[PDB]
Design a protein around this nucleic acid. Structure first.
Ligand SMILES: Nc1ccn([C@@H]2CS[C@H](COP(=O)(O)OP(=O)(O)OP(=O)(O)O)O2)c(=O)n1
Ligand SMILES: OC[C@H]1O[C@@](CO)(O[C@H]2O[C@H](CO)[C@@H](O)[C@H](O)[C@H]2O)[C@@H](O)[C@@H]1O
Ligand SMILES: [Mg+2]
Lengths: 406, 553
DNA sequence: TGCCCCCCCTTCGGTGCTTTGCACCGAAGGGGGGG
């Protein structure tokens, strides 16, 4: 078959990103995986005269118990030409977030039956390290549509439609969405009933070449205010600064008649009685925050942003937005790991969960603002990653002024 | 001889042509050195004569070699390197002897004439044009081009390395229980075969290299311990660094101190407890490498301590993969940490130190976490796994940090070890306001354009103060306002500020800072008994904050 | 009067913030070491 001509964006060069260190077991797996891929002509040994590189690592799903090679093509995807520009992109269906259950299938291997523009292959190089630098790195590049490259779903688009038409034909109320190497397949069938056409969809796929999500319990978590019999100056100061923040989000929240209960230079522990007109202000403000904000709509032409705060005892709050203070979703992630002993694992799992929700809902992952030092994240995150995609992220140091989201 | 391996295709960067540079003068001993090498290089096919049809040029020289009575030929390809395409370098790191296993039989070989045994892409050769001068009198020179990898060209190390990997790969696959450490042209070869079979494998590997054009001179074939390797000495059961000679000087320049610090950092991989904070402080704010710097008293002490450590002989041991790796860290003061990695007690694989200051404001618990991260990365590089940690911090201290600090943080499986000074939080902010403690409302403002400002407070007990400030900033006056509240309050205090900046720093429980002002605040926080610190928004007429904001103007 | 790699310590300059300095970060200068 014929390559599809592919280009970088104008005036950009290919990725040049250093390989990071890997454990013994990940290097062994990469050497087993790449050796076999070399033999099947999917990749080719290259040398140092190719000046491009992209980091490679491996993930092992606990249920699968087998390694999965993951090449971090984030840099390459940013520099690759848009395909919605050429109109080869994958439409998002609004029905997916409606379904009772959604299973994720890794279908990256179907990409390996389509060859890649020979002029583009050099941009796909990667380098396997060696323990104690016993040897120089070993380098490959792809001859086929790579896993993890945003061009592969787009180029393979015409084909997976043909592969899936009978299944969709036969199951009109199951909805299937392709995102990168993944198929998101949702339905309303009973919990163990849904699983079985999952397994049938598999056989139709294994006849050319995660764990059940449940969206209708992706509860939103709004801003709430404490309820008490008696209120300190400090309580009312904390209450006033929290509502003042929230008036950047909601309309007509007012502080004038809680703020003057604090007229005077008063002790933080003095108990100030609530006036009739402060009780009014507060129960009023309590419901403006009761239901969602009026005037906030998704824009597919703009990026999604996600913020997370650590709250403690295994809880993590998050907000997804595109314009500041216009949240499309606010949530609370709760760790179920067990011991409650690992912040980095909890955050890594929270990022996968949030990103998965954005895929199901809007069809793309958000750029994360992560509440962690860069070097703490980079020491550990790959040990807990289980997705075939990797979102954009950046690192922030923002103390809480208010505890808005508790 | 020249390898029959395929050449590596190489390109100039797009738009670029080749270099055009005149040659300079060299001594008579550095023309005979090269002509001996140059008509002999031509005899072996390494270079060929060119003339005026090729318009490119690049100058040439020679330098002495540690091996006495051999010279190293070099061409100054700085211009060509600029116009030559980028490479992805395959040397990702440096092997370390603590990552080696014990082996019954060991050999170390060098490949001779390494670069000159690898051919250069046909179409690129003409860009390597040069000229040989001959004293600069009565002859201009004759022109050659390289047919093999030139020393001084940007692509030569990578194309040699990659070529060597392709040549070795058949042999490694054939003998999987022979470890070959390949660094440039240097080959370490270990096995568990009796020395008989081992030497069979060796000369078999030597013959494989020779069919591909790579000699292994006997001069550099090491057969007996101790082997000289990568700057170390390999004994059967242990390894040493080759001797480290520190400068000793009556008068010191910046550049001398720079040399001294570098030697000590190199020593610190096996000599426990090395410190360089006070010697490196001398380098700050200087402005010439020949500037004489007098050692401070603290630097002399630190130098003398390091000198005592260096007089004592040390050795590392090799890696036993059937035992855990263990990493133990000690605190040295002024943001300095030293560590040891071992498997059996008092038998170090290696040592090291961590002493970077990350951030304007930090504490010992964060820096301990950074040391742990640096050790974890180094262990992955050398041994492919992370170690069990032994740390001088209590479980309670750590647990109070990751509950009170708002960023995700972690450290792996660790056991407390009592080696004072222990790492500890130096104060903790109260989660709730303190009954009976005075309430200070603080504020500071500066004038953007003037440099002038004020810091002050008012109090629920009627106390109030305003101090003038000169040559300051907005953020400084806010820090200053908190400084005064702490200075004038008792052992327990409640503080309300409108600076999220100041709250941000202090809520992170810093114990050191590059700021003298923040340092002064830290010493006051450490002397207090309880402190609650609260924020309110500015300019919303809030009781307390409004009155002090009123007062600062 | 050269090349490539790793490390540490210091300086400098670009980025973004409901900023007007400040904190962060990557690159580049010096040094060590390897070939
Ligand atoms: N100062 C240096 C040292 C080494 N090199 C490179 C790194 S590896 C390669 C080795 O060159 P050669 O083997 O031909 O000469 P050697 O000095 O090693 O002796 P022999 O091995 O006896 O042939 O030269 C360099 O470019 N600059
Ligand atoms: O974690 C950031 C760190 O990772 C690298 C890869 O080594 O960059 C990756 O992550 C970035 C943040 O989303 C992407 O912008 C980038 O394209 C991707 O390779 C480093 O470059 C970066 O320092
Ligand atoms: Mg040699």
């Amino acid at each position: 078959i014929e390559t599809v001509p592919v280009k970088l964006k104008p005036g950009m060069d290919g990725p040049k990103v250093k390989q990071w260190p890997l454990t013994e077991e990940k290097i062994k797996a990469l050497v087993e995986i790449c050796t076999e891929m070399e033999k099947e002509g999917k990749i080719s040994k290259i040398g140092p005269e190719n000046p491009y590189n992209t980091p490679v690592f491996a993930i092992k799903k606990k249920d699968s118990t087998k390694w999965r090679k993951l090449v971090d093509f984030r840099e390459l995807n940013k520099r690759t030409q848009d395909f919605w520009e050429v109109q080869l992109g994958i439409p998002h269906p609004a029905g997916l977030k409606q379904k009772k259950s959604v299973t994720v299938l890794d279908v990256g291997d179907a990409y390996f039956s389509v060859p890649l523009d020979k002029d583009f292959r050099k941009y796909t190089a990667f380098t396997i390290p060696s323990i104690n630098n016993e040897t120089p790195g070993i380098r490959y590049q792809y001859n086929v549509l790579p896993q993890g490259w945003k061009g592969s779903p787009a180029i393979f688009q015409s084909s997976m439609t043909k592969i899936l038409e009978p299944f969709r034909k036969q199951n009109p109320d199951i909805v299937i969405y392709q995102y990168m190497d993944d198929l998101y397949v949702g339905s309303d069938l009973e919990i163990g009933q849904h699983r079985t056409k999952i397994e049938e969809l598999r056989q139709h796929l294994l006849r050319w070449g995660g764990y059940e999500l449940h969206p209708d319990k992706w509860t939103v978590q709004p801003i709430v205010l404490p309820e008490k019999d008696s209120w300190t100056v400090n309580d009312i100061q904390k209450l006033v600064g929290k509502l003042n923040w929230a008036s950047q989000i909601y309309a007509g929240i007012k502080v004038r008649q809680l703020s003057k209960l604090l007229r005077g230079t008063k002790a933080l522990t003095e108990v100030v009685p609530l006036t009739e007109e402060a009780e009014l202000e507060l129960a009023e403000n309590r419901e403006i925050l009761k239901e969602p904000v009026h005037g906030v709509y998704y824009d597919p032409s703009k990026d999604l942003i996600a913020e997370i705060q650590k709250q403690g005892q295994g809880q993590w709050t998050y907000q997804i937005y595109q314009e500041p203070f216009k949240n499309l979703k606010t949530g609370k992630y709760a760790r179920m790991k067990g011991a409650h002993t690992n912040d980095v694992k909890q955050l890594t799992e929270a990022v996968q969960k949030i990103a998965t929700e954005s895929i199901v809902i809007w069809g793309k992952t958000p750029k994360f603002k992560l509440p962690i030092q860069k070097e703490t994240w980079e020491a550990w995150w790959t040990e807990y990653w289980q997705a075939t995609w990797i979102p954009e992220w950046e690192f922030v140091n923002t103390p809480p002024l208010v505890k808005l989201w508790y | 001889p020249i390898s029959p391996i395929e050449t590596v295709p190489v390109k100039l960067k797009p738009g670029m042509d080749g270099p055009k540079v005149k040659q300079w003068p060299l001594t008579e001993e550095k023309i005979k050195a090269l002509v001996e090498i140059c008509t002999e290089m031509e005899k072996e096919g390494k270079i060929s004569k060119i003339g005026p049809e090729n318009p490119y040029n690049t100058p040439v020289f020679a330098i002495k070699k540690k091996d006495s009575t051999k010279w190293r030929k070099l061409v100054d390809f700085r211009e060509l390197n600029k116009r030559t395409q980028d490479f992805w370098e395959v040397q990702l790191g440096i092997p370390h002897p603590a990552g080696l296993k014990q082996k019954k039989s060991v050999t170390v070989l060098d490949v001779g004439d390494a670069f000159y045994s690898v051919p250069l892409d046909k179409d690129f050769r003409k860009y390597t044009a040069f000229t040989i001068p001959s004293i600069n009198n009565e002859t201009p020179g004759i022109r050659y081009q390289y047919n093999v990898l030139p020393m001084g060209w940007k692509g030569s190390p990578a194309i040699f390395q990659s070529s060597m990997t392709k040549i070795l790969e058949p042999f490694r696959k054939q003998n999987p229980d022979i470890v070959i450490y390949q660094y440039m042209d240097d080959l370490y070869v270990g096995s568990d075969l009796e020395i008989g079979q081992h030497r069979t494998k060796i000369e078999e590997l030597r013959q494989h290299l020779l069919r591909w054009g790579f000699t292994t001179p006997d001069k550099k074939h090491q057969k007996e311990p101790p082997f000289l390797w990568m700057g170390y000495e390999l004994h059967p059961d242990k390894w040493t660094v080759q001797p480290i000679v520190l400068p000793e000087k009556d008068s010191w320049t910046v550049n001398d101190i720079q040399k001294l610090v570098g030697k000590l950092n190199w020593a610190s991989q096996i000599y426990a407890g090395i410190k360089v904070r006070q010697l490196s402080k001398l380098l700050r704010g200087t402005k010439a490498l020949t500037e004489v710097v007098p050692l401070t008293e603290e630097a002399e002490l630190e130098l003398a301590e390091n000198r005592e450590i260096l007089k004592e002989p040390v050795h590392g041991v090799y890696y036993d993969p059937s035992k855990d790796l263990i990493a133990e860290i000690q605190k040295q003061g002024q943001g300095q940490w030293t560590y040891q990695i071992y498997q059996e007690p008092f038998k170090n694989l290696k040592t090291g130190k961590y002493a970077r200051m990350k951030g304007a404001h930090t504490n010992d618990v964060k820096q301990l976490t950074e040391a742990v991260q640096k050790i974890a990365t180094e262990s992955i590089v050398i041994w492919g796994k992370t170690p069990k940690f032994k740390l001088p911090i209590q479980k309670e201290t750590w647990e109070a940090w990751w509950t009170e600090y708002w960023q995700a943080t972690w450290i792996p499986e660790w056991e407390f070890v009592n080696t004072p000074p222990l790492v500890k939080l130096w104060y903790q902010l109260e989660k709730e306001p303190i009954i009976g403690a005075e309430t200070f409302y603080v504020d500071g403002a500066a004038n953007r354009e003037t440099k002038l400002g004020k810091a002050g407070y008012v109090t629920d007990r009627g106390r109030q103060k305003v101090v003038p400030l000169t040559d300051t900033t907005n953020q400084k006056t806010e820090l200053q306002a908190i400084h005064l509240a702490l200075q004038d309050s008792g052992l327990e205090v409640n503080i309300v500020t409108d600076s999220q900046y100041a709250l941000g720093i202090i809520q992170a429980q810093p114990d050191k800072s590059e700021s003298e002002l923040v340092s002064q605040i830290i010493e006051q926080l450490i002397k207090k008994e309880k402190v609650y610190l609260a924020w309110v928004p500015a300019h919303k007429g809030i009781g307390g904050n409004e009155q002090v904001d009123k007062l600062v103007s």
